[PDB]
Design a protein around this ligand. Structure first.
Ligand SMILES: CCCCCCCCCCCCCCCCCC(=O)OC[C@H](COP(=O)([O-])OCC(O)COP(=O)([O-])OC[C@@H](COC(=O)CCCCCCCCCCCCCCCCC)OC(=O)CCCCCCCCCCCCCCCCC)OC(=O)CCCCCCCCCCCCCCCCC
Ligand code: BCL
Ligand code: BCL
Ligand SMILES: CC[C@H]1c2cc3[nH]c4c(c3C)C(=O)[C@H](C(=O)OC)c4c3nc(cc4[nH]c(cc(n2)[C@@H]1C)c(C(C)=O)c4C)[C@@H](C)[C@@H]3CCC(=O)OC/C=C(\C)CCC[C@H](C)CCC[C@H](C)CCCC(C)C
Ligand SMILES: CC[C@H]1c2cc3[nH]c4c(c3C)C(=O)[C@H](C(=O)OC)c4c3nc(cc4[nH]c(cc(n2)[C@@H]1C)c(C(C)=O)c4C)[C@@H](C)[C@@H]3CCC(=O)OC/C=C(\C)CCC[C@H](C)CCC[C@H](C)CCCC(C)C
Ligand SMILES: COC(C)(C)C(=O)/C=C/C(C)=C/C=C/C(C)=C/C=C/C(C)=C/C=C/C=C(C)/C=C/C=C(/C)CC/C=C(/C)CCC=C(C)C
Ligand SMILES: COC(C)(C)C(=O)/C=C/C(C)=C/C=C/C(C)=C/C=C/C(C)=C/C=C/C=C(C)/C=C/C=C(/C)CC/C=C(\C)CCC=C(C)C
Ligand SMILES: COC(C)(C)C(=O)/C=C/C(C)=C/C=C/C(C)=C/C=C/C(C)=C/C=C/C=C(C)/C=C/C=C(\C)CC/C=C(/C)CCC=C(C)C
Ligand SMILES: COC(C)(C)C(=O)/C=C/C(C)=C/C=C/C(C)=C/C=C/C(C)=C/C=C/C=C(C)/C=C/C=C(\C)CC/C=C(\C)CCC=C(C)C
Ligand SMILES: COC(C)(C)C(=O)/C=C/C(C)=C/C=C/C(C)=C/C=C/C(C)=C\C=C/C=C(C)/C=C/C=C(\C)CC/C=C(\C)CCC=C(C)C
Ligand SMILES: COC(C)(C)C(=O)\C=C/C(C)=C/C=C/C(C)=C/C=C/C(C)=C/C=C\C=C(C)\C=C\C=C(\C)CC/C=C(/C)CCC=C(C)C
Ligand SMILES: [Fe+3]
Lengths: 274, 51, 43, 256, 325, 50, 51, 44, 44, 51, 44, 51, 44, 51
């Protein structure tokens, strides 16, 4: 159904391709040309996961594991039950993610708003793309992608992390992790200010932007503002996604030794006395 | 000669602060490179002497 | 003419004092370098 | 303690299931708190929809608005509802787009649609209106970037529709909000506001691409040149965004 | 293209905003010293306004310096007061926790005794800062969400260094005060107790850590997408919903079938961020005190994946084949 | 002496709170240092006396 | 003696909450450092007496 | 004559008297407790 | 004459007289405690 | 030397006294910590070594 | 003249006279502490 | 000579605090440099002399 | 006539006269300290 | 010859700062380059020359 104010926004137009052939809503969801392709790719990918789960012998969501082919297969196609199903699901997943981002473009174009959200999602797609196709392409085998399992893909992260003997020493991991712990820092404080101002102690008037502007001024000596927090906030999270993409694309295609060994440039600088 | 006109362009307080920071950092750097060399490290030379 | 709003007469007064300090700072450095060269020549 | 309560259900497993109950309650609490506006759902015809969702409406919460603006309970009749919308249904059923019956930007439907906010200016902590022109603002001046005052304004089709006479600032936050445009007699009659977020300021000009030259004469005006109400703010901003789809048929039609 | 509101293209600077006041008389303890930075003004507000310095703030600042200095003085003395070596090993040196042989007793100053004293000042410094957040909210007559969210972060902070070492019966379980050493502790902690990936609360904390960055990328992008409708003025959009709140809601309703309000978004924002250390604190508290091995816990509870392929490299290639000879 | 004029500069409220917090943190820190040593740890001395 | 004027500068409500939580935090900390001690752990000592 | 909390001299004077009564009562129990525990297991 | 925080010279005079009474009382207990500790276990 | 009293015209006595007090204690604590770190001037270790 | 903080010449002189008296007392204690320490364990 | 004009350009309040932190940091740094050398470490030399 | 800090030329000499007095006193102590440490363990 | 017109284009205050920064960095870089070489390093030559 609609909302109390949704009717005036459900106007014709704003599509990128397909026009009014697909321009309709199914329930609350907007269906476009890319909503059709999202439905096809997401359903095909989801079904193939359960088809692979059926032949794997278990339907347990924790134990479901669609793994990539062996490194011997290289960049070619593998038998569907020897890692080939993972390749098709990856194609379906990439097609579903791109369609989802392009569907968001149609939605925000129909609403006359900025394309920040589809761009921000594209960074998440890029982080997935650099994990499943870009890094395997550079390393010469599709078997370097993570498997499609709830807990099976954690073993890939653990093994790939220890494939460089201490993965915390990755300089791009440090930058990326610093962005996650700070993005959650910014989310906690930004969500707190609006809630604190809009929900004062009972029996007292709500506060405006000035009161929260002067609160962190009184708290930490500086306030970035109502608009600034969303601007730095998108940048903090986008940098978190981007630098996470960087830390894994340099682990193996650009750096093969241990990550602690990378910091040897700093230790043995000529300026440091022996 | 005629260099006094440099103060018609440069702010005396903005340059004196810059000169003071630059001069000390330059002095510290040269003292540091002297200590890096084994020949001019007066702390190590004193250790070598009378020992 | 004067980007700092400072008169020509003032600039000559400022430079004369500044040069006097510069030579005094350099005079100490000359003596300091002479002592170092005697103690440990680098040429 | 390293003993299992039963089978393999230890203290670690007990805490996990305790969090499952808390998270389920939290999800219910978070979703209901998200339903203070926009509900009941209704349908295309405007009648209340048969389906209302698994989550019930939350209990009413009361906001004590400042500056003597009364109380506010979000769950209830919405004063921002717009009536006499100029739209018609393209299908007799639900889930289909509405076709505007006239000029979508003039009627304010779709990307050009505004909301019936309060017809009073937003006020800062002191009480006076939040957004004021720099001429009225005391002690304010440009500190960085290009000053848009005096630069010509270029529309989406390249037409020069006037020059920026003044720009409105949020003196509470020291942020630029709008730019006044002194519309040329060939294009408009008086002064129109454009939000800072829809105008790109260049070295020699300010360019707004959403609105063509012929649409500036229809930009909503303000009752007074010293302040802008929330209703005028909502009408002005929505008009420019509506041009992103309604400036020409090419924008509305699919790009491929 | 259209102006993406990422950097402000024109800045206006007026009289410095000293802040609001009420009968609590905030202005007594404010510094009344303001500065404007045009570099930070491109992305955010440019005023480096006055900071309210109370007694919780001063005590936290003073005691935090003592912890900072005691750690620093030890690190400097660890390298024999060699400043070039201290700078070179700055990321490697630390104030290591006490040896496990001392239990919860006070260890010698060189073997973690200064660690406890430095930790004591850090604990006082962190709690004092939290009290400042609580007191400032009470004196500003606003909600205590900032203090409550901070307390969630302190919960993991207290569990890591105070609660779990007490429950484990040894001060050696604390985290070393070093850049790399607390990374080594993070890796060693996972290895010692099995695999922390298989800790459900570590997995749960990652869900909210991922969700926090996911939401705050979504919220940041959505607000910037509707900032052309004054969406950055969220508070005025809560008391009087404009088209910015409507389009932001309808964008996510048409995308994923449900949305939030301009106020309800921050409740999602607050709780996902707050649940990140709360679940992490529980997961760390259950590590060693209860479990001591998480992968075996996963195997026992039947959610550890099982692999049928062989493990050696000889099963997939040869040494000569890998070398290309 | 004329040390009574220090209160003409320092606020009596501020010093007493600072003096109270500083003295307790001093006493706690000094006591912990004694516990660190093996010759002045009175808890360990009692054990060694039995 | 004359210390009754200490309340002329301190808020009794503000002190007592700080003066109250401090005593319990002190008492809890003192009680725990005896538990960590072998000679004064009354819980572990009763087992020794029982033998 | 001087008060930073808005209390007169006599009002704070009786505030202290009742306060010390709690302080002496608290210390009296503590003195007995330390005296009792020193007899039990002395630390000196 | 000069009073940054406000109270008169006479008020500051009586404030210090009471303050030193507490300071000397605090030091007197500290000296006795230090004297007793040195007899129990000297550190010199 | 005898005219050093003019330093209180340049400096606010309130903030300098606070700065001096914090610096003096931090100096005293730092030097004691340096002495404790040595193998010869650790008066706590010497007391144990003498018994 | 030249009062950056409002203190007059006599007020600054009076404050410095007390400050010097406090400084010398602090220094006198330091010398005695340093004198005793050197006798106990000299560092030269 | 006539270097008193430096106070017409430099604010006496700002320089005095600037040189105060600089002097102590320089004095502390040079003392630490001595402590990093075997020859000039007066703390470690007292231990050797006593033995 | 030149002044960026508002100090009069006449009273700048007054401040600098004391500042030299502090400088020479600080330097005189440094010379004695440097003289003492050179006799102790020379660095030349 | 008539190169003096460059000041009509370049702001004298802007170019002087840029030239001063450029000249020192160029001088410092060249000095550091000579130290890198094993033939023009005057610090290491003095050690070798002194035998
Ligand atoms: C053609 C399809 C193409 C794609 C297919 C392929 C997709 C494969 C995966 C599919 C996964 C499910 C996707 C959603 C299914 C469709 C939903 C739908 O059509 O409407 C539902 C339908 C409403 O019909 P409607 O057409 O939307 O009409 C409008 C409403 O009447 C108006 O009522 P309203 O205004 O109150 O809003 C209604 C809203 C009401 O619902 C809500 O309000 C949602 C709020 C809670 C969600 C946020 C919390 C999640 C964040 C943390 C999650 C991680 C936690 C981890 C564990 C933590 C500790 C427990 O319903 C929704 O639309 C929410 C849908 C999204 C639900 C959450 C999606 C999954 C997230 C969790 C992942 C689970 C793994 C799934 C993998 C399954 C693979 C087989 O009824 C429901 O609302 C039930 C909710 C459905 C839950 C199913 C979730 C699956 C598990
Ligand atoms: C032994 C393990 C090593 C380690 C090895 C690795 C490895 C290996 C990796 C990381 C990577 C990451 N590590 Mg590390 N790392 C370690 C320790 C840590 C610690 C810590 C506190 O100890 C932290 C915080 C991190 C943090 C992180 C981030 C930098 C990053 C996480 C992925 C990412 O950003 O998302 C990016 C991922 C996406 C955005 C997913 C995209 C989602 C798609 C587009 C949408 C999904 C839709 C889907 C179908 C769901 C829809 C279904 C329902 C309908 C909703 N690491 C340890 C030391 N780390 C990972 C990384 O960077 O990946 C790029 C990586 O590969
Ligand atoms: C080999 C590495 C192990 C590992 C070992 C651990 C350990 C060990 C821990 C985590 C924990 C965390 N891990 Mg893990 N983790 C690994 C792999 C990962 C991966 C990944 C992609 O591989 C990711 C994304 C994560 C992600 C996370 C976060 C979800 C979580 C931290 C919560 C939090 O916000 O902390 C942020 C909180 C803080 C930083 C502490 C609070 C700080 C206080 C309040 C601030 C005081 C400031 C101080 C005074 C300094 C102030 C200075 C200022 C300048 C003034 N881990 C692998 C399995 N992980 C934590 C956890 O379990 O949570 C349940 C944890 O303890
Ligand atoms: C800036 C980077 C951050 C980010 C941003 C981000 N993500 C986004 C967006 C944005 C701005 C959206 O607008 C979009 C959205 O609408 O979210 C609600 C989205 C989104 N990112 C999501 C989740 C998500 N975000 C993550 C992280 C991040 N995304 C970063 C922290 C992660 C992590 C860390 O893993 C996840 C899981 C979704 C909720 C949504 C994308 C919805 C989507 O793609 O829908 C189409 C597809 C389907 C409905 C199902 C497709 C199924 C496939 C065909 C088969 C399976 C493939 C997959 C590889 C399975 C693997 C499973 C195992 C790994 C367990
Ligand atoms: C869990 C979700 C996120 C989170 C939440 C969170 N953190 C928070 C809050 C919240 C909600 C606050 O309200 C609070 C705050 O005030 O934020 C601004 C805070 C905070 N958490 C912080 C950081 C932080 N957040 C972290 C993580 C996170 N916490 C997540 C990202 C981490 C990590 C990764 O562990 C850290 C380190 C602080 C910035 C802040 C409060 C800490 C604080 O101020 O403690 C008091 C200490 C001091 C004032 C001094 C500390 C030491 C100084 C560096 C010493 C001085 C040095 C200087 C050179 C002087 C030298 C003098 C000598 C030479 C004499
Ligand atoms: C590594 O370092 C190692 C070696 C480990 C280390 O430990 C380093 C040690 C170091 C550095 C020692 C530093 C200690 C110092 C400097 C000691 C300061 C201590 C002082 C100064 C003691 C004041 C006591 C006064 C009080 C506390 C109350 C007075 C009480 C009265 C009651 C006040 C109120 C009076 C009234 C009359 C009432 C009010 C009246 C009116 C309102 C009218
Ligand atoms: C070995 O290599 C490494 C290790 C790298 C190294 O060490 C490198 C070392 C290097 C580079 C040394 C660099 C140091 C230099 C150059 C030292 C200059 C420093 C100087 C000179 C500072 C003197 C300050 C003393 C004064 C001046 C006190 C003044 C005291 C008085 C009391 C104040 C004045 C008071 C008044 C004015 C009253 C107010 C008056 C009125 C209100 C009227
Ligand atoms: C048989 O035995 C024989 C063989 C005899 C024998 O023993 C051989 C020994 C032999 C040969 C001695 C070899 C040693 C020698 C030679 C020692 C080097 C001597 C040195 C290094 C001299 C230091 C003086 C430097 C100062 C003290 C500068 C003070 C700097 C001032 C303070 C300026 C900074 C202040 C400012 C204000 C400027 C900034 C300006 C603005 C900010 C505007
Ligand atoms: C191996 O090589 C390595 C190490 C790599 C390397 O990099 C080599 C180093 C290299 C290449 C650096 C190149 C060095 C250079 C270029 C040296 C610059 C040094 C200069 C220029 C000396 C200025 C001295 C100025 C003073 C000190 C004035 C004193 C001022 C006095 C105090 C007066 C102040 C004013 C007043 C008192 C009042 C005035 C006001 C009125 C009258 C109103
Ligand atoms: C690696 O480094 C190693 C080697 C480790 C190292 O240690 C190197 C250490 C290094 C370099 C630090 C060298 C320290 C220095 C230089 C600090 C000298 C300290 C000085 C100078 C200050 C002391 C005296 C201050 C008092 C204590 C005044 C008494 C104040 C009184 C009490 C105030 C009374 C006043 C009034 C009541 C006002 C009257 C009011 C009216 C009339 C209204
Ligand atoms: C230039 O200045 C000088 C000065 C020279 C200098 O060097 C500057 C200092 C420098 C460079 C040091 C740089 C510091 C660094 C890198 C430290 C990083 C720090 C890190 C990563 C922190 C890890 C996390 C630790 C936890 C998680 C703690 C939690 C524990 C808390 C505190 C709980 C309380 C614990 C207790 C035990 C209670 C004790 C109390 C009683 C027993 C009552
Ligand atoms: Fe927000």
């Amino acid at each position: 159904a609609l909302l109390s104010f949704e009717r005036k926004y459900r106007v014709r137009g704003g599509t990128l391709i397909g026009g009014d052939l697909f321009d309709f809503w199914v329930g609350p969801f907007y269906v476009g040309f890319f909503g059709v392709t999202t439905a096809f790719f997401a359903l095909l990918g989801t079904i193939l996961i359960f088809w692979g789960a059926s032949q794997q012998g278990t339907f347990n969501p924790w134990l479901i594991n669609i793994a990539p082919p062996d490194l011997s297969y290289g960049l070619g196609m593998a038998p569907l039950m020897e890692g080939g199903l993972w390749q098709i699901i990856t194609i379906c997943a990439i097609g579903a993610f791109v369609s989802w981002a392009l569907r968001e473009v149609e939605i925000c174009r129909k609403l006359g708003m900025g394309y920040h959200v589809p761009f921000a999602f594209s960074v998440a797609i890029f982080a997935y793309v650099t994990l499943v196709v870009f890094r395997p392409l550079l390393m010469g085998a599709w078997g370097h992608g993570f498997p499609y399992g709830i807990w099976s893909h954690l073993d890939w992260v653990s093994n790939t992390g220890y494939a460089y003997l201490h993965f915390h020493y990755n300089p791009a991991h440090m930058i990326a992790v610093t962005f996650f712990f700070t993005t959650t820092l910014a989310l906690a404080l930004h969500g707190a200010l609006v809630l604190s101002a809009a929900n004062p102690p009972k029996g007292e008037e709500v506060k405006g932007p000035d009161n929260e502007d002067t609160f962190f001024r009184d708290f930490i000596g500086y306030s970035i503002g109502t608009l600034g927090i969303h601007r730095v906030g998108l940048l903090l999270a986008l940098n978190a996604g981007f630098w996470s993409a960087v830390c894994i694309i340099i682990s193996g295609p650009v750096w093969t030794k241990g990550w602690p060994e990378w910091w040897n440039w700093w230790l043995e600088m000529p300026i440091w006395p022996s | 000669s005629k260099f006094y006109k440099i103060w018609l362009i440069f702010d005396p307080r903005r340059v004196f602060v810059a000169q003071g920071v630059f001069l000390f950092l330059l002095a510290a750097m040269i003292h540091l490179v002297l200590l890096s060399t084994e020949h001019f490290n007066w702390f190590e030379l004193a250790a070598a002497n009378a020992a | 003419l004067s980007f700092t709003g400072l008169t020509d007469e003032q600039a000559q007064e400022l430079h004369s004092v500044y040069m006097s300090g510069l030579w005094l700072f350099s005079a100490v450095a000359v003596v300091a370098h002479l002592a170092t060269f005697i103690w440990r020549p680098w040429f | 303690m390293e003993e299992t309560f039963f089978g393999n259900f230890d203290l670690a497993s007990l805490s996990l299931w305790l969090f499952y109950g808390f998270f389920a309650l939290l999800i219910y609490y978070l979703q209901t708190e998200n339903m203070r506006e926009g509900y009941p759902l209704e349908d295309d015809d405007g009648n209340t929809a048969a389906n209302q969702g698994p989550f019930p409406l939350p209990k009413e919460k009361t906001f004590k608005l400042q500056h003597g603006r009364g109380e506010l309970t979000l769950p209830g009749e919405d004063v921002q509802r717009r009536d006499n919308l100029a739209l018609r249904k393209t299908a007799h059923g639900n889930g289909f787009p509405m076709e505007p019956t006239g000029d979508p930007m003039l009627d304010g439907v779709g990307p050009a649609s505004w909301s019936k906010r309060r017809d009073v200016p937003e006020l800062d902590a002191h009480g006076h209106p939040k957004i004021v022109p720099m001429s009225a603002a005391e002690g304010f001046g440009v500190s960085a970037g290009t000053d848009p005052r005096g630069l010509p304004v270029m529309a989406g089709d390249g037409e020069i529709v006037g020059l920026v006479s003044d720009m409105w600032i949020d003196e509470a936050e020291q942020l630029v909000r709008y730019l006044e445009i002194e519309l040329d007699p060939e294009w408009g009659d008086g002064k129109r506001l454009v939000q800072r977020e829809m105008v790109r300021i260049k070295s020699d000009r300010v360019k707004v691409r959403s609105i063509y030259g012929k649409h500036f004469k229809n930009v909503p005006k303000t009752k007074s040149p010293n302040q802008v109400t929330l209703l005028e703010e909502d009408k002005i901003m929505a008009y420019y965004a509506g041009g992103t789809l309604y400036a020409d048929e090419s924008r509305l039609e699919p790009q491929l | 293209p259209e102006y993406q509101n990422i950097f402000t293209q024109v800045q206006v600077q007026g009289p410095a905003e000293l802040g609001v006041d009420n009968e609590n008389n905030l202005t007594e303890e404010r510094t009344t010293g303001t500065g404007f930075s045009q570099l930070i003004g491109w992305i955010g507000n440019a005023q480096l306004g006055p900071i309210y310095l109370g007694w919780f703030g001063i005590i936290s600042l003073v005691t935090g310096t003592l912890w900072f200095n005691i750690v620093g003085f030890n690190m400097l003395s660890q390298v024999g007061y060699s400043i070039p070596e201290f700078i070179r090993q700055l990321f490697w040196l630390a104030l290591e926790p006490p040896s496990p042989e001392y239990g919860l007793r006070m260890p010698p100053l060189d073997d973690g005794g200064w660690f406890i004293i430095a930790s004591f000042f850090l604990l006082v410094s962190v709690i004092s800062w939290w009290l400042r957040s609580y007191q400032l909210a009470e004196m500003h007559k606003m909600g205590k969400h900032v203090a409550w969210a901070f307390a969630a972060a302190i919960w993991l902070f207290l569990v890591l260094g105070l609660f779990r070492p007490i429950l484990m019966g040894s001060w050696s379980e604390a985290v070393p005060y070093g850049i790399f050493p607390h990374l080594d502790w993070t890796t060693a902690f996972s290895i010692r107790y099995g695999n922390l990936y298989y800790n459900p609360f570590h997995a749960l904390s990652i869900v909210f850590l991922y969700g926090s960055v996911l939401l705050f990328a979504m919220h940041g992008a959505t607000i910037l997408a509707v900032t052309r409708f004054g969406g950055d003025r969220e508070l005025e959009q809560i008391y009087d919903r404009g088209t910015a709140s409507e389009r932001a809601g309808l964008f996510w309703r048409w995308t994923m079938g449900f949305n939030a309000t301009m106020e309800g978004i921050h409740r999602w924002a607050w709780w996902f961020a707050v649940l990140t250390p709360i679940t992490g604190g529980i997961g760390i508290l259950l590590t060693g005190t209860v479990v001591d091995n998480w992968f075996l816990w996963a195997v026992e509870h039947n959610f550890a994946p099982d692999y049928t392929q062989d493990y050696g490299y000889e099963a997939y290639t040869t040494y000569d084949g890998f070398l290309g000879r």
